[PDB]
């Protein structure tokens, strides 16, 4: 049953990575 | 404006709100103490204080209560085995409830001090701005703490007007709370002499009282005032952190190595009891004297108390558990039932083979039998192909003395191997592996847990002191070069 927890944690980390690339603060000069 | 790690700096120049925040912290600490005591009382089992002591059940707060004199409980039982009739308010439950009430009152006081922050007391008449005379506040608080230390030493330890402290035997068989007379000599600095505690507290009281009077009267010199920045509260913070991690290191060391303030019966045996064969040597000496006075070997071994034999077991070694093996020791082996008796290994020529006990480092150790001169005589072969020391080739027998198996002997091959493997690690005991679903793995003492937590906290607080002292010294530049 802990396989579900491990999978959830890994997918959540991947989603966080996804949001940090395509939804980042645009740096302006 | 303020980054997340800098959020608590608003209370830097609001003497009033500081008090409120320190009071909130005090309330949280007291509430934790009370709630932890209540939980431990809920899960405690005061049935057998011989083979199921407090340290065996994972109690962390109970030893600190029992050290200072709290033994009775409202349930009618006593930690020293006896029964108590009508204990007073100062039982385990009374202490827990008192702490919870203190937490609540501190919470209310914190609310009041946060709401009424602008008190004229925290103002400087000369300038009109909030300010604290730190060299004078220090004198006041140090004088108070010296008075408290002297009172505790003279009245609550010497038993003049107090219960006393926990005092035990050299082997932790008969220990109880009693007043301790101070030792005003070189032996007062013996860490294992309980009179040293009373002597220290009385002398350090009479010393800190005079120090506090001095600080109340005498003003600082200008050179020190400018050098130490004795007008900035953060230098107080850094120095206090310094003292705190110094104290944490000292306490962790004294618990790991043992002292009069960390008795065996409360926190369990130390690591170094097992290395030097402390209890094993004591057991051998007692058996030798019982034989010398004239008695059968079986009855000589049957006079050894079960507590003493239980100390000589590797499951009670604090340096044996793991970091993530959670729970009490009973979760590791089960609740100890009874002593199985001391086995004696003999071979065909009637020698006395002894099983080499495993050291604390190893987790798997081979079963090896050696004679009185340390020469291999038998073992359990890993590869039984050309083994010349197997337990079957060299006939070896066991004869249990003084226990559940007292007077019994075994000549069979598999049973001798079973008992050799059992006796490879300390004495042999009977455990209940079903009450808690005990798995096959050891666990650590409250001694080890306290030492680990406090050593790590001290190591972190050294860094905290470094950072804060550096921030005090570089205050003017701490915004940009």
């Amino acid at each position: 049953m802990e396989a579900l927890v491990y999978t959830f944690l890994l997918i959540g980390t991947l989603m966080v990575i996804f949001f940090a690339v395509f939804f980042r603060e645009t740096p302006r000069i | 404006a303020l980054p997340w790690y800098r959020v608590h700096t608003v209370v830097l120049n609001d003497p009033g709100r500081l008090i409120a925040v320190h009071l909130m912290h005090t309330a949280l600490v007291a509430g934790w103490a009370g709630s932890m005591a209540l939980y431990e009382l809920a899960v405690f089992d005061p049935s057998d204080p011989v083979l199921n002591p407090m340290w065996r059940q994972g109690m962390f707060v109970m030893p600190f209560m029992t050290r200072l004199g709290i033994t009775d409980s409202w349930g009618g039982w006593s930690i020293t085995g006896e029964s108590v009739s009508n204990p007073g308010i100062w039982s385990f439950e009374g202490v827990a409830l008192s702490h919870i009430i203190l937490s609540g009152m501190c919470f209310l006081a914190a609310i009041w001090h946060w709401v009424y922050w602008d008190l004229e007391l925290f103002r400087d008449p000369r300038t009109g701005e909030p300010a604290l005379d730190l060299p004078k506040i220090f004198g006041i608080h140090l004088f108070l703490s010296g008075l408290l230390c002297f009172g505790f030493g003279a009245f609550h330890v010497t038993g003049l007007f107090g219960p006393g402290i926990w005092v035990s035997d050299a082997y932790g068989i008969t220990g109880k709370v009693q007043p301790v007379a101070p030792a005003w000599g070189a032996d007062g600095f013996n860490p294992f002499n309980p009179g040293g505690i009373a002597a220290h507290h009385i002398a350090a009281g009479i010393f800190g009282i005079f120090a506090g009077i001095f600080h109340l009267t005498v003003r600082p010199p200008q050179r020190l005032y400018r050098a130490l920045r004795m007008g900035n509260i953060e230098t107080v913070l850094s120095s206090s952190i310094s003292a705190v991690f110094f104290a944490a290191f000292v306490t962790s060391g004294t618990m790991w190595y043992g002292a009069a303030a960390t008795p065996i019966e409360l926190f369990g045996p130390t690591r170094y009891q097992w290395d030097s064969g402390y209890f094993q040597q004591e057991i051998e000496r007692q058996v030798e004297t019982s034989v010398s006075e004239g008695l059968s070997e079986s009855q000589a071994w049957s006079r050894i108390p079960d507590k003493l034999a239980f100390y000589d077991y590797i499951g009670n070694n604090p340096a044996k558990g793991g970091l993530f093996r959670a729970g009490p020791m009973n979760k590791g082996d089960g609740i100890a039932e009874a002593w199985l008796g001391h086995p004696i290994f003999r071979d065909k020529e009637g020698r006395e083979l002894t099983v080499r006990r495993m050291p604390a480092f190893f987790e798997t150790f081979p079963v090896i039998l050696v004679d009185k001169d340390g020469i291999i005589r038998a073992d359990i072969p890993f590869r039984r192909a050309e083994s010349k020391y197997s337990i079957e080739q060299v006939g070896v027998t066991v004869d249990f003395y003084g226990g559940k198996l007292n007077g019994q002997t075994f000549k069979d091959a598999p049973t001798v191997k079973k008992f050799a493997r059992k006796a490879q690690l300390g004495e042999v005991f009977e455990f209940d592996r079903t009450s808690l679903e005990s798995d096959g793995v050891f666990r650590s003492s409250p001694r080890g847990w306290y030492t680990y937590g406090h050593a790590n906290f001290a190591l972190l607080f050294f860094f905290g002191h470094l950072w804060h002292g550096g921030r005090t010294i570089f205050r003017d530049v701490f915004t940009g070069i």
């Binding site: - | 011989v50 039982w77 085995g81 029964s83 008969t174 108390p305 079960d306």
Partner: protein, 248 residues
């Protein structure tokens, strides 16, 4: 106070006072020398102290010791109005209890919160005195049996009982419908009723001859209650005083 003093008091003066449990004292040590065929018309057995056999460690060693315990039931324990025929087989006084209020439900609480109910009874007693005349220094002794604390008509919280009630645990129907159904539960579904044994030892003290009354001190050890065989019963030790009047 003695029976001659309680008989002066009216019922209104006694109610509530709590002396209904107390046993009348006897004064004026003397010898009765009972006539054969006489019997004890009244007999009050009052326990003054209760203890339960328990295991406790003194200095690293555990041994069977009787630990004290406070009684939870208020003022029920005392027995009274026990009657029995005294006989002389070989010149020895034998009480032989026959009838009277001789049982008394009682609950006592051990240190640690343990509650031990037991039936304090003197039934089928057979005393064997150390002579004849009930005289200062007499001893009786004897053995007795203790009936079941709960009779057949008692129902468990789930509705199971011996003479009446469900034979199984109706709350759990999945335990049925399986070849070997409720078995682990058979120990609790089956209600057994067994009689125990108790040993009492009575020593006589000051004996009045004019009023034909005897008083003294008893020591009794009775087997505790077993919850219809669900739990192993405990051992209860009891000591106190007594009083009895012999009619000749």
């Amino acid at each position: 106070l003695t029976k001659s003093q309680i008989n002066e008091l009216s019922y209104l003066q006694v109610k509530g006072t709590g002396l209904a449990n107390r046993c009348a004292e006897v004064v004026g040590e003397d010898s009765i020398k009972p006539k054969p065929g006489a019997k004890l018309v009244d007999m009050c057995i009052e326990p003054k102290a209760w203890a339960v056999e328990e295991e406790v460690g003194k200095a690293g060693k555990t041994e069977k010791k009787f630990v004290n315990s406070k009684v939870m039931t208020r003022q029920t324990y005392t027995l009274d109005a026990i009657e029995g025929p005294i006989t002389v087989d070989g010149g020895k006084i034998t009480f032989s209890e026959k009838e009277g209020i001789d049982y008394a439900a009682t609950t006592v609480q051990l240190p640690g919160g343990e509650r031990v109910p037991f039936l304090f009874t003197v039934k089928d007693l057979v005393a064997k005195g150390n002579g004849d005349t009930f005289k200062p220094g007499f001893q009786m002794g004897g053995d007795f049996n203790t009936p079941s604390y709960r009779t057949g008509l008692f129902l468990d919280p789930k509705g199971r009982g011996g003479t009446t009630g469900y034979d199984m645990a109706v709350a759990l129907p999945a335990l049925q419908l399986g070849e070997e159904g409720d078995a682990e539960l058979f120990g609790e579904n089956n209600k057994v009723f067994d009689i125990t044994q108790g040993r009492i030892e009575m020593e006589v003290n000051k004996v009045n001859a004019e009023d034909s009354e005897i008083g003294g001190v008893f020591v009794a050890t009775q087997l505790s209650d077993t919850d219809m065989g669900s739990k192993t019963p405990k051992k209860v030790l009891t000591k106190g005083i007594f009083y009895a009047k012999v009619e000749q």
